[PDB]
Amino acid sequence: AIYADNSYSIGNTPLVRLKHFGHNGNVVVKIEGRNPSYSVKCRIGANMVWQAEKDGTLTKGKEIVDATSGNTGIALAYVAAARGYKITLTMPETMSLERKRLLCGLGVNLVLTEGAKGMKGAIAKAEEIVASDPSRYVMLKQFENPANPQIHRETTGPEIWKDTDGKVDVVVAGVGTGGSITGISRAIKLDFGKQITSVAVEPVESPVISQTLAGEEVKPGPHKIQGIGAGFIPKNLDLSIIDRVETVDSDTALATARRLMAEEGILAGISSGAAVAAADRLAKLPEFADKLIVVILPSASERYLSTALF
């Protein structure tokens, strides 16, 4: 069909079988880079806006505000542009020129916050703008907004089910907001009734899900796996449906993403390398020898040209 605007075109991303990972082709990857603004977040940027429309919290002339300049910020920016909303994004002044350029290109009103305050300062400024005129501004809250996992239950999950003819046995996904693994797992286990293994992936540098589930002190840390390892348990991570948690280190995530590019011709982002590294570890366990492992690849390589990836 013909999509009425770019937001409706989300999803329907392909599955590709890996040749240099897994055992006898048991690892398949879902390419979320193939989306309106080239990441998995396109789905949630679309659905958070759509749901805010449906529930009346977002109306014509109201303005979106957020403190993300990562994939979610980019996603919200294309959706705002596609649907005629003004959007303000806050971010530390020390964010890259490429990212400022991208966001400005999409028509975002960028508000640069004090470098020394980091993300905390950007978040406080966003909250400040909203509080200044609550009837004018809407903050969509990707870590807690149920529209995030819901779109994965409605689209991402069913796509995996359909494209594997119900043969999927394991889903492996890095956790940022938790929305992907949560929605996918709800779709497959609850809507399609299949008892799969749901595998959350987090950085070994900030293994807060592992520490939490073990009853150990939660000690977040810095890492380079952009998009995952938020340093807390997000509301959109449904721990009830998580079967296993795999930790992967930043160097290995980067090396793996580089291998995806050079050995598979898949232009994967950093966190995609993390998810595949975790999946390859499971794929080479005899217990998973005859099992179909589907891995989410959240983003694409060109978004990382200025990073350690290249």
């Binding site: 977040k41 994939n71 979610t72 993300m119 978040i123 990707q142 870590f143 907001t177 390892g229």
Partner: peptide, 4 residues
């Protein structure tokens, strides 16, 4: 980091 939470810049997701």
């Amino acid at each position: 980091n939470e810049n997701i």
